[PDB]
Write a protein that binds this DNA or RNA. Structure first.
Ligand SMILES: [Zn+2]
Ligand SMILES: [Zn+2]
Lengths: 72, 93, 796, 113
RNA sequence: AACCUUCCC
RNA sequence: UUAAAGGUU
């Protein structure tokens, strides 16, 4: 199941990078640190909270329309 | 071509090492600062000294190439700055 | 027992407390530099012949001041008496006593030497050369005794590591003045032996850690005014410690004392020849072979190495700003440039261009190509830079803003992963799992990789052993052929790659290879044989899949160096890549049975075969300059016919100028490269293979010479050891017969398979267990003392 | 236990002279170090005050090599000849080790005062 | 291993 | 680390 977390972390960092996040140095540094550390985790009980911390980054902007894109 | 001719004419043969050409002739200095503590010992104040010369600060930018005033660089306000600070200055006389 | 103690102390009135009980001796374990008519080497032996006495200090404190007595025969007593009353007035001679005492029923002679130290300098050299983590027990005592560190410093984690504990460089450097004073004291001993008419061999077994000399057992006397101090093994074995402990730092201060401030040299001074000769006369007075401060006057490759070693030692005293291109103003069409017309190498001294053109009229395409590549104008027109992020020397910043480069996270192929998961893959508790990903990086990535080039240190190599090793290593490259070729014969793989710092602003390598005809390329190549062309190599950042999060970077070397290095090593290396069955397996495919053939070849007739492998921790960023120069020399060895001596030297100078200590442009600013190797040039893999073979041969030599020798039960191996010592430290010229014999021995008992920095070796297990061929600890010690790198079991 | 030179190096008779072709027939005691890849002499002994050139014909005979010598070294040997004031010459470029070997052999098996 | 010889200080 | 070579069973 940890593979799912690592793959979705890869996808989340991809969309974050393409949302021009890397135009702010420190935010991109923290996101890169979280993404690199999630890929190296060995238990699912730390990857999940680092994953939620990394998702809180994208849930703070206003470039991703959320209600539309969770059309289910 | 005036601050470089003088130092060249003083050479015995005319040959001078390359690494001393910008040290004693260039008219702009750009220091890169990783943290506030290193900022304190090197680039403190509006004027500092380096390479046996006196330089005066004119412009400071952060990693995002946005302007930072000299009043914002404190100890407690440091965590709110992108911190490869680039400080550019002119050789004063 | 009491009278012996009251006679050993004698007039000096010392409070000796016997370390050995009774009137008997005290066997110890000490390192010796030994050469009989039977046995030779530099190995640890058991030393009886001695009755030690420690001296007490006022309040019964024990100090390091020993009164070592020596029981021996009457003839030796007479011989050492008649020679000590000749070297008595030299400060560097420990005081002898020469008494006779009635031990048991007969009267026996003793030679009491007063106030020595527990360890000699053979012990220090052995401890710092043959290093092992958990058997130190004497390096610790030497460091603690002379207040280089404390006892609780050894309870740290990886206190011996040069990479993860870079403070050990400071602990060793506090033991670097007792070595300078020892050299100063041995110069006086040599002068006294000269003026007193004495001949003998100076071995570092007879010099305690103060500097005094205390044995005259194997000396002979001649007419006064002609005495011969034979110092060849002494200095050669001592060489690595001189730079490892940074012994000549006191030469950086005025009047050569560490309390006074540093000497303020002139900024415009670039020729330090007189200072180099002064230092050589100061410390290496009786080194017989001649010394050329500027390697442009050397006689051949061997003399180039010999003088470059001393230049390596002597260039750590002079300011870092004096090394680099020597620029000079020239006039053309009335317009003055500032162009490079020479170089000042730390290793090769001062080199001047022969075809400098002053007051020219026009710049052809060749001249425009040359002047656009050197860093002269680019550095002189840019502004000053002071970068606090790195310790490496920073010269200039070309632009008004620095650039931060990031690395992308990498895409995800979801369909394949879903297919694999549907096939029962990637479950919990599976032997297969994802470990390789695309790792992202923040803004400061390359400037963080330069602090890994920070790892390179100036290293002095044991010159005699290095010369023998280079002669042996040259025999692994005999089946090949090489030489220069014309511009017609060059074969370029890909013409859509970048041409370098300047020149990338205008096209790829295709444009510059069409534009110039064959005649222009030949003219440039012929120019490079009598001039130096410094260049700039860009620092690109790679983007690939890996299992560890390090931001690997590569070097975009310029185009002129590419052309001129091709017109040499294209023909040199196409033969290497097209040979099957050799030691170097570059160019051999693993398909169609290549792997099986390679493995069966490496198993070629070994008696009790075991397999072993190792990997260098940081090969590119920690390789010393001396070994890179050695690899370049053995590669250029193939030009005995097409190039004269001057052409070879200037080609070597060009290589050292543009692939060893070049000027790198990392993120829009120019920095000075300390050394190492630049991955991205023409001959990286082949030079790495040469360096690997050199390290393996050095490990074998160290393993063979450090074996006891009296215990070796095979006559052939014992004679091999004896003649190996003779050919190392008693011959100035190459002996091809013994080189062939030792190469055959190594090929028989130690079979290698080399590819760049990777190696697999099949070795005789019995000989390795007996210490006749190199083991893995022999590799670790060699790496420690000749690479400034500590290797662990994670690589071997 | 480092020994200067186990085994002794022997000597032949050779010819020398002051400069160029001044070598007449045979005037020197040449202490040699013979190797099977060509013979290489170590030292020269003479009763002649100042000889700078010496010569030896090559093994093929068609050639003859000249050797340049250092300034003399003076000593006295004891013999049935009484005292002998002799001057010794090292071919310039001789290392310290060959000098030491020759001097040790001389001081060991040749009388000196 | 015993053993002796020209010895070796 | 212990002159050398030779000698016998
Ligand atoms: Zn030289
Ligand atoms: Zn050539």
């Amino acid at each position: 199941k940890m593979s799912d977390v690592k793959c979705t972390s890869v996808v989340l960092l991809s969309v974050l990078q393409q949302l021009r996040v890397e135009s702010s140095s420190k935010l991109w540094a923290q996101c890169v640190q979280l993404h690199n550390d999630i890929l190296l985790a060995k238990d699912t009980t730390e990857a999940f909270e680092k994953m939620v911390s990394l998702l809180s980054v994208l849930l703070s902007m206003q470039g991703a329309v959320d209600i539309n894109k969770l059309c289910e | 071509n005036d601050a470089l001719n003088n130092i060249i004419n003083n050479a015995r043969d005319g040959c001078v090492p390359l690494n001393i050409i910008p040290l004693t002739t260039a008219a702009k200095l750009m220091v890169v600062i990783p943290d506030y503590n290193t900022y304190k010992n090197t680039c403190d104040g509006t004027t500092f000294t380096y390479a046996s010369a006196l330089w005066e600060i004119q412009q400071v930018v952060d990693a995002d190439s946005k302007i930072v005033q000299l009043s914002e660089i404190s100890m407690d306000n440091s965590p709110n700055l992108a911190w490869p600070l680039i400080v550019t200055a002119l050789r004063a006389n | 027992a009491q009278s012996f103690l009251n006679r050993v102390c004698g007039v000096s009135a010392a409070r000796l407390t016997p370390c050995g009980t009774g009137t008997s001796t005290d066997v110890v374990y000490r390192a010796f530099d030994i050469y009989n008519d039977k046995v030779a080497g530099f190995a640890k032996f058991l030393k009886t012949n001695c009755c030690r006495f420690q001296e007490k200090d006022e309040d019964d404190n024990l100090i390091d001041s020993y009164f070592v007595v020596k029981r021996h025969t009457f003839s030796n007593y007479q011989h050492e008496e008649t020679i000590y009353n000749l070297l008595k007035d030299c400060p560097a001679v420990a005081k002898h006593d020469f008494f006779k005492f009635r031990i048991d029923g007969d009267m026996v002679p003793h030679i009491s030497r007063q106030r020595l130290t527990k360890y000699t300098m053979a012990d220090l050299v052995y401890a710092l050369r043959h290093f092992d983590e958990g058997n130190c027990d004497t390096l610790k005592e030497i460091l603690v005794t002379y207040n280089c560190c404390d006892d609780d410093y050894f309870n740290k984690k990886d206190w011996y590591d040069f990479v993860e504990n870079p403070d050990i460089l400071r602990v060793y450097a506090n033991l670097g003045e007792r070595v300078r004073q020892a050299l100063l004291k041995t110069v006086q001993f040599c002068d006294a032996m000269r003026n007193a008419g004495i001949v003998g061999v100076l071995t570092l077994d007879n010099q305690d850690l103060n500097g005094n000399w205390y044995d005259f057992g194997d000396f002979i006397q001649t007419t006064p005014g002609s005495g011969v101090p034979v110092v060849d093994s002494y200095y050669s074995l001592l060489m690595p410690i001189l730079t490892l402990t940074r012994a000549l730092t006191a030469e950086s201060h005025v009047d050569t004392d560490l309390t006074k401030p540093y000497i303020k040299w002139d900024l415009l001074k670039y020729d330090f020849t007189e200072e180099r000769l002064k230092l050589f006369d100061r410390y290496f007075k009786y080194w017989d072979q001649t010394y050329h401060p500027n390697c442009v006057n050397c006689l051949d490759d061997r003399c180039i190495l010999h003088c470059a070693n001393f230049n390596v030692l002597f260039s750590t005293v002079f300011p870092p700003t004096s090394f680099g291109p020597l620029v000079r103003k020239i006039f053309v069409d009335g317009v003055p440039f500032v162009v490079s017309t020479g170089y000042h190498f730390r290793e090769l001294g001062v080199v001047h261009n022969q075809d400098v053109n002053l007051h020219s009229s026009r710049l052809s395409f060749k001249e425009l190509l040359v002047y656009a590549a050197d860093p002269a104008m680019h550095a002189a027109s840019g502004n000053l830079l002071l970068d606090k992020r790195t310790t490496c020397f920073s010269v200039a910043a070309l632009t008004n803003n620095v650039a931060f480069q990031t690395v992308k996270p990498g895409n995800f192929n979801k369909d394949f992963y879903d297919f694999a998961v549907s096939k029962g893959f990637f479950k919990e508790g599976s032997s297969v799992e994802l470990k390789h990903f695309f790792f992202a990086q923040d803004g400061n990535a390359a400037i963080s990789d330069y602090d890994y080039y920070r790892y390179n240190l100036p290293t002095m190599c044991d010159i005699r052993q290095l010369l023998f090793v280079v002669e042996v290593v040259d025999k692994y490259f005999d089946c090949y052929d090489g030489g220069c070729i014309n511009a017609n014969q060059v074969i370029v793989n890909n013409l859509d790659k970048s041409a370098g710092f300047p020149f990338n602003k205008w096209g790829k390598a295709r444009l510059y290879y069409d534009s110039m005809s064959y005649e222009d390329q030949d003219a440039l190549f012929a120019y490079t044989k009598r001039n130096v062309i410094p260049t700039i190599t860009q620092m690109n950042l790679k983007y690939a899949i890996s299992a560890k999060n390090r931001a690997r970077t590569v070097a975009g070397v310029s185009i002129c160096s590419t052309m001129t290095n091709r017109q040499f090593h294209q023909k040199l290396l196409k033969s290497i890549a097209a040979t099957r069955g050799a030691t170097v397996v570059i160019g051999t495919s693993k398909f169609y049975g290549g792997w099986h053939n390679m493995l069966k070849t490496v198993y070629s007739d070994v008696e009790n075969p075991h397999l072993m492998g190792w990997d260098y921790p940081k090969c590119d960023r920690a390789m010393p300059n001396m070994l890179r120069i050695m690899a370049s020399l053995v590669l250029a060895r193939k030009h005995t016919t097409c190039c004269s001596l001057s052409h070879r030297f200037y080609r070597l100078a060009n290589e050292c100028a543009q692939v060893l200590s070049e000027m790198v442009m990392c993120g829009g600013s120019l920095y000075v490269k300390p050394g190492g190797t630049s991955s991205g040039d023409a001959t990286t893999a082949y030079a790495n293979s040469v360096f690997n073979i050199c390290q393996a041969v050095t490990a074998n030599v160290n393993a063979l010479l450090s074996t006891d020798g009296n215990k070796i039960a095979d006559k052939y191996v014992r004679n091999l050891q004896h003649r190996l010592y003779e050919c190392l430290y008693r011959n100035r010229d190459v002996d091809t017969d013994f080189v062939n014999e030792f190469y055959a021995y190594l090929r028989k008992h130690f079979s290698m398979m080399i590819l760049s920095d990777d190696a697999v070796v099949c070795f005789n297990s019995t000989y390795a267990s007996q210490g006749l061929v190199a083991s893995i600890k022999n590799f670790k010690s060699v790496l420690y003392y000749q690479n400034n790198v500590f290797m662990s079991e994670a690589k071997c | 236990n480092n020994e200067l030179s186990p085994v002794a190096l022997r000597q032949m008779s050779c010819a020398a002279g002051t400069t160029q072709t001044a070598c007449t027939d045979d005037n020197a005691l040449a202490y040699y170090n013979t190797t099977k890849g060509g013979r290489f002499v170590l030292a020269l002994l003479s009763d002649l005050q100042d000889l700078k050139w010496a010569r030896f014909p090559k093994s093929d005979g068609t050639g003859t090599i000249y050797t340049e010598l250092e300034p003399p070294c003076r000593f006295v040997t004891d013999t049935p000849k009484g005292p002998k004031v002799k001057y010794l010459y090292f071919i310039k470029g001789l290392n310290n080790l060959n000098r030491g070997m020759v001097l040790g052999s001389l001081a060991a098996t040749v009388r000196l005062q």
